Amino acid sequence: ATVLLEVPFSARGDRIPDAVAELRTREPIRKVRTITGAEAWLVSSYALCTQVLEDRRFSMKETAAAGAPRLNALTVPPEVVNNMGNIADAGLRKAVMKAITPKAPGLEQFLRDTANSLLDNLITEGAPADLRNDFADPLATALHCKVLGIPQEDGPKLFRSLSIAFMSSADPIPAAKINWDRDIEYMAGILENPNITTGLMGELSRLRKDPAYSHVSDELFATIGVTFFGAGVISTGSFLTTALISLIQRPQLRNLLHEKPELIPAGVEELLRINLSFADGLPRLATADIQVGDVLVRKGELVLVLLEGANFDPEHFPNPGSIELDRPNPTSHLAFGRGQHFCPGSALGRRHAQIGIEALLKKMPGVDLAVPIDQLVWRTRFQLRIPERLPVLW
Amino acid sequence: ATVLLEVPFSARGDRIPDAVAELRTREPIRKVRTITGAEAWLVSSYALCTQVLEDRRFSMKETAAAGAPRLNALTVPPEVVNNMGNIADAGLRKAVMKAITPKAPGLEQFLRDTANSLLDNLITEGAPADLRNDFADPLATALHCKVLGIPQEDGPKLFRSLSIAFMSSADPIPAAKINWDRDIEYMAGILENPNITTGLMGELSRLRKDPAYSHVSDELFATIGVTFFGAGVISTGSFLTTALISLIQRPQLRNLLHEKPELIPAGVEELLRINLSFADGLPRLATADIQVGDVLVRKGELVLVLLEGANFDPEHFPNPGSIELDRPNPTSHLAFGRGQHFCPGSALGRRHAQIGIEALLKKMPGVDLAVPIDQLVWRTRFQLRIPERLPVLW
Ligand code: HEM
Ligand code: HEM
């Protein structure tokens, strides 16, 4: 006798398990057990992943319901699971989205300057350098302070919540509430601070005092700041880190992008496609009985959309493990999700990675791992896959 | 068909695998495969572990021989594997050992002051606190700068070598050589620096200019500094970290030691006994054919002495998983090894942990984990077991 197949499969973010292709072939929707002991349906083909993400009867909001089968414990108040819906209902969606594009004058130059300063510091200090803790994550943090309009010096403390806030735990996490409440208080203070006039928080601060938003709660305004800082920083820092591993392990590609930096956007799209940063499938709760492939999913059941299932599906992306800069369907990957909950930071995430990679290749064209790849330490029981340190030489 | 049993079993340092007791019962010496692909004999009973450690025909030195079966790749030059032998041959053993006791006037007060300052800073900042990165490891680092006689401000850079220097890798690690060579250069400079007059390096600096040591190499003097700093810092920081987990998970014991701090030495001895800090068995190479239990170990074979095998052996320590402060054989554990290579820092390691625990319990009597214990992230492919962060509240 063997137990029901457990998820997640592996915390390693440098390779996809051979087992994913076998599951996709044999049983592209199949029952699994999550870390809480709940059962769920794991969906692993491009076709079925798209179907689930584009049918809102597979609900994000309802995953927060009391008594639902859970992927993991909430690390935010249950109403915050519906954050984007709350933003939309408040009439804030257009303004929030506009504030988090890469388009504000000076933003891209700020990114480039920041990346180059971080890299110059590493070069001065001498190899080895840790490209996660001393490049990708500080670049993400600096970017998001700028995007939010908050002081750069406040970034590190907000950043330090994230190793707990984005845990994927079987049980509630007391530290997550301590940090959440503190970070909310910080954002509430920002909204009251007359010096904060730019970025997302500057704009929210103005809208909060406009009559058209008089009955939008101060709680929601503060929540937008905490959620967007955290989601953006953890996702961009983690993606850039693991994209750098993918690049470093492909000297031919590294050299090509170094020689022809105009190809970096196409390279980043492929790096997004093959990215293993999301450690769990995206959760949804069925609100009706719905046929998904050979399975009739029942109302109240949990569905997990495995992004690397879709993104490595050879029926959609032939030779899926290879980075090919000339695919006919390059942005059709699910790295940013799909449907109602498609990532609102996608353009900013792309630009962060493009600029970070461009700067690194110019400054460190000889970049290579400084330890054997198996020596990287992969963070466990976390919503993202990342190496704790990324030691390189150049 | 199944593969030969692989070592190590688990990087988690908060619990011993049920499998260790089964191996000890069924096959207290048995064949395993190491991360390099080599075969080895894993020894897991107190009786057989002692036998191996007390027979120098199971040689530490010879593990460094070219072409030997390996537990892991060398991270130091092969001659440095025989460091203690080299020290003894140079006539330096007595002086080195004397410099690394906890006995120098002011040392214990320095430890207490340092621990209390670190804890006061955590209390000011507010929970959660990371007791590894912001307590145990800085306390270890500060201690070893003091013991060596080197500037406190030089500690962090030397410390940063350790996440690579103590890797347990299948292959050589290029960063380990970069850091090794740099740290040797640092210690060579210390030996030439007239300001360095105290501690281990102050004493070595004097002996280096004494006629009785004129033909001891400058390489060996520098090597003593790098090796003792690294071994001491990694071992004490890691032991204190995982001992704190053991304590925190035993509120009754925490409270008892808080109430009766005179029991802390007995508590630390039990914490040493149950400690899972060594991630691999201690390696030795047979230099003769030697009977160990039911196995005739052949010349040239690798033997791995599993310390938790010995220390959790119920035939030697009844109710081995329980901390009992009134055992009749309390220091007879193998936490510091046994025989020729018994830890030369044992007294200092004991005092570091005793003082750290005493200070923590006084300052944070309510100390508890701030995350569920399964959320700790255990470092992989490392010579020690440690959580990357240890989040607590109080
Ligand atoms: C390369 C970096 C990024 C990746 C790979 C990424 C990925 C994703 C994915 C897969 C989702 C969908 C979750 C689901 O459907 O369950 C998502 C949603 C989200 N992303 Fe991103 N993201 C990135 C960057 C950003 C940035 C820069 C921000 C904001 C500054 C951001 C904010 C959000 C938020 C707030 C959501 C939730 C949307 C909702 O619930 O409707 N992300 N992201
Ligand atoms: C609680 C903390 C410590 C623990 C648990 C510990 C454990 C051990 C063990 C098990 C060995 C034996 C290795 C073998 O036989 O293969 C050893 C050896 C050694 N220890 Fe420690 N140690 C600690 C603290 C220290 C300190 C504070 C120092 C120096 C300042 C130190 C320096 C060394 C050195 C240099 C060796 C190698 C001895 C040899 O090769 O003969 N250790 N230690």
**Which residue of B380, B386, B393 is the best one to mutate when testing the A interface, meaning the one whose CB has the most A CBs within 10 A?**
B380
Q: Give the resolution to one decimal, in Å.
A: 1.1
Say how far apart CA A246 and CA A62 lie, in whole Å.
36
Helix (H, G, I), strand (E, B) or coil at A364: coil
Q: Is the peptide bond before B330 cis (omega within 30 degrees of 0)?
A: no
**What CATH fold (topology level) applies to the domain B1-394?**
Cytochrome p450 (1.10.630)
List of residues 6+ apart from B206 with CB closer than 8 A = none
Residue B39's identity, in one-letter code, is E
Q: Are the beta carbons of A277 and A242 closer than 8 angstroms?
A: yes
Q: Within 6 Å (CB) of ligand 2, which residues are found?
A: B 60, 83-84, 100, 227-228, 231-232, 235-236, 239, 277, 282, 335-337, 341, 343-345, 348-349
Say how far apart CA B254 and CA B266 lie, in whole Å.
13
Q: Is the peptide bond before A265 cis (omega within 30 degrees of 0)?
A: no
Chain B residues touching residue A167 (CB < 8 angstroms): 371, 375
Q: Which tokens in the block code for residue A340?
A: 């109602």
Say how far apart CA B70 and CA B62 lie, in whole Å.
11
Q: What's the sign of the alpha-carbon dihedral B232, B234, B235, B240?
A: positive
The CA distances from residue B3 to A306, B7, B279, in Å, are 30, 12, 21
Q: Is B198 annotated as a binding residue?
A: no
Neighbours of B117 (CB within 10 A): 14
Helix (H, G, I), strand (E, B) or coil at A382: strand
- Where on the phi/psi map is residue B286: left (φ > 0), alpha (ψ -120 to 50), or beta? beta
Q: What's the sign of the alpha-carbon dihedral B240, B243, B249, B255?
A: negative
Say how far apart CA A190 and CA A222 lie, in whole Å.
8
Q: How many residues does chain A have?
A: 394
Residue A119's identity, in one-letter code, is L
CA distance A129 to chain B (A): 10
In our burial notation (b when 16+ CB lie closer than 10 A, e otherwise), range A209-229 reads eeeebeebeeebbbbbbbbbb
In our burial notation (b when 16+ CB lie closer than 10 A, e otherwise), range B221-253 reads bbbbbbbbbbbbbbbbbbbbbbbbbbbbebeeb
**C-alpha triplet A347, A351, A354: angle, nearest 5°:** 140
Q: Whose CA is nearest to atom 17 of ligand 1?
A: A343
Distance of CA B254 to the CA centre of its chain: 23
- List A311's β-bridge partners, or say none: none
The CA distances from residue A144 to A152, A222, A233, A269, B234, in Å, are 9, 15, 7, 21, 35
Q: Which tokens in the block code for residue A392?
A: 């390189």
Say how far apart CA A23 and CA A11 lie, in whole Å.
18
User: Which H or E element spans position A352?
Assistant: helix A346-363
Q: For strand A129-130 and strand A391-393, is the pairing parallel, antiparallel, or unpaired?
A: antiparallel
Q: Which tokens in the block code for residue A38?
A: 């709940």
Say how far apart CA B259 and CA B31 lie, in whole Å.
47
Neighbours of B134 (CB within 10 A): 17
Are B379 and A377 an interchain contact pair (Cβ–Cβ within 8 Å)? yes
Q: Which tokens in the block code for residue A102?
A: 């890469």
Q: Are the beta carbons of A61 and A81 closer than 8 angstroms?
A: yes
Say how far apart CA A98 and CA A101 lie, in whole Å.
6
Method in brief: X-ray
Q: Is the peptide bond before B128 cis (omega within 30 degrees of 0)?
A: yes
Say how far apart CA A184 and CA A76 lie, in whole Å.
11
Chain A residues touching residue B167 (CB < 8 angstroms): 371, 375
Say how far apart CA A274 and CA A385 lie, in whole Å.
13
Residue A91's identity, in one-letter code, is G
Going from the Cα of A232 to the center of ligand 1, the distance in angstroms, rounded, reads: 7
Q: Which tokens in the block code for residue B366?
A: 């309510």
Helix (H, G, I), strand (E, B) or coil at A132: helix
Whether A349 lines ligand 1, by a CB cut-off of 6 Å, is yes
Distance of CA B49 to the CA centre of its chain: 18
Q: For strand A39-43 and strand A302-305, is the pairing parallel, antiparallel, or unpaired?
A: parallel
Place of tokens 């800085």: B138
Q: Are the beta carbons of B321 and B344 closer than 8 angstroms?
A: no
Place of tokens 């990532």: A343
Are B371 and A167 an interchain contact pair (Cβ–Cβ within 8 Å)? yes
Whether A239 lines ligand 1, by a CB cut-off of 6 Å, is yes
Maximum separation of any 2 CA atoms in chain A, in Å? 65
Going from the Cα of B305 to the center of ligand 2, the distance in angstroms, rounded, reads: 15
In our burial notation (b when 16+ CB lie closer than 10 A, e otherwise), range A235-273 reads bbbbbbbbbbbbbbebeebbebbbeeeeebbbbbbbbbb
Neighbours of A180 (CB within 10 A): 22
Q: Are the beta carbons of A139 and A114 closer than 8 angstroms?
A: yes
CA distance A379 to chain B (A): 6
Helix (H, G, I), strand (E, B) or coil at A33: strand
Domain map (residue ranges) of chain A: 1-394
Say how far apart CA A184 and CA A220 lie, in whole Å.
10
Say how far apart CA B33 and CA B17 lie, in whole Å.
18
Whether A186 lines ligand 1, by a CB cut-off of 6 Å, is no
Q: What are the φ/ψ torsions at residue A297 (nearest 5 degrees)?
A: -75, 130
Number of H helices, E strands in chain A: 15, 10
Helix (H, G, I), strand (E, B) or coil at A345: coil
Helix (H, G, I), strand (E, B) or coil at A58: strand
Q: Which tokens in the block code for residue B9?
A: 């079993």
Say how far apart CA A268 and CA A319 lie, in whole Å.
17
The CA distances from residue A179 to A175, A184, B8, B338, B370, in Å, are 6, 8, 36, 46, 11
List of residues 6+ apart from B358 with CB closer than 8 A = B112, B261, B264
Closest CA to B41 of B18, B15, B69: B69
Q: What is the DSSP letter of A167?
A: B
Helix (H, G, I), strand (E, B) or coil at A211: helix
The alpha carbons of chain B give a radius of gyration, in whole angstroms, of 21
Q: For strand B302-305 and strand B39-43, is the pairing parallel, antiparallel, or unpaired?
A: parallel
Q: What are the φ/ψ torsions at residue A166 (nearest 5 degrees)?
A: -105, 20
**C-alpha triplet B72, B133, B345: angle, nearest 5°:** 60
Say how far apart CA B128 and CA B388 lie, in whole Å.
15
Residue B63's identity, in one-letter code, is T
List of residues 6+ apart from A304 with CB closer than 8 A = A7, A32, A34, A40, A41, A42, A43, A71, A280, A281, A282, A283, A284
Chain B residues touching residue A378 (CB < 8 angstroms): 380
Q: What is the DSSP letter of A29?
A: E
Mutate-to-test residue for ligand 2 from B52, B75, B235, highest number of ligand atoms within 8 A of CB: B235
- List A290's β-bridge partners, or say none: A297
In sequence order, what DSSP letters do the residues of A255-320 get, joined into one string?
HHHHH-GGGHHHHHHHHHHT---B-SPEEEEESS-EEETTEEEPTT-EEEE-HHHHHT-TTTSSST
Question: Could you tell me the strand order of the sheet in which A129-130 lies?
Answer: A129-130, A391-393, A368-369
Q: Is B321 exposed, middle or buried (0-12, 13-18, 19+ CB in 10 A)?
A: exposed
CA distance A107 to chain B (A): 32
Are A381 and B375 an interchain contact pair (Cβ–Cβ within 8 Å)? yes
In sequence order, what DSSP letters do the residues of A224-255 get, joined into one string?
HHHHHHHHHHHHHHHHHHHHHHHHHT-HHHHH
Say how far apart CA B298 and CA B288 lie, in whole Å.
6
Q: Which tokens in the block code for residue A73?
A: 């414990």
Say how far apart CA B4 and CA B39 lie, in whole Å.
9
* 3-class SS string, chain B: CCCCCECCCCCCCCCCCHHHHHHHHHCCEEEEECCCCCEEEEECCHHHHHHHHCCCCEECHHHHCCCCCCCCCCCCCHHHHHHHHHHHHCCCHHHHHHHCCCCCCCHHHHHHHHHHHHHHHHHHHCCCEECHHHHHHHHHHHHHHHHHCCCHHHHHHHHHCHHHHCECCCCCCHHHHHHHHHHHHHHHHHHHCCCCCCHHHHHHHHHHCCHHHCCCCHHHHHHHHHHHHHHHHHHHHHHHHHHHHHHHCCHHHHHHHHHCHHHHHHHHHHHHHCCCCECCCEEEEECCCEEECCEEECCCCEEEECHHHHHCCCCCCCCCCCCCCCCCCCCCCCCCCCHHHCCCCHHHHHHHHHHHHHHHHHHCCCCEECCCHHHCCECCCECECCECCCEEEC
Chain B residues touching residue A164 (CB < 8 angstroms): 128, 370-371, 375, 391
Q: Which tokens in the block code for residue A332?
A: 């059709």
Say how far apart CA A391 and CA B179 lie, in whole Å.
12
Say how far apart CA B71 and CA B168 lie, in whole Å.
8
The CA-based dihedral angle spanning residues B149, B150, B155, B158, taken in that order and rounded to the nearest 10 degrees: -110
* Pick from B171, B178, B389: CB nearest A128: B178
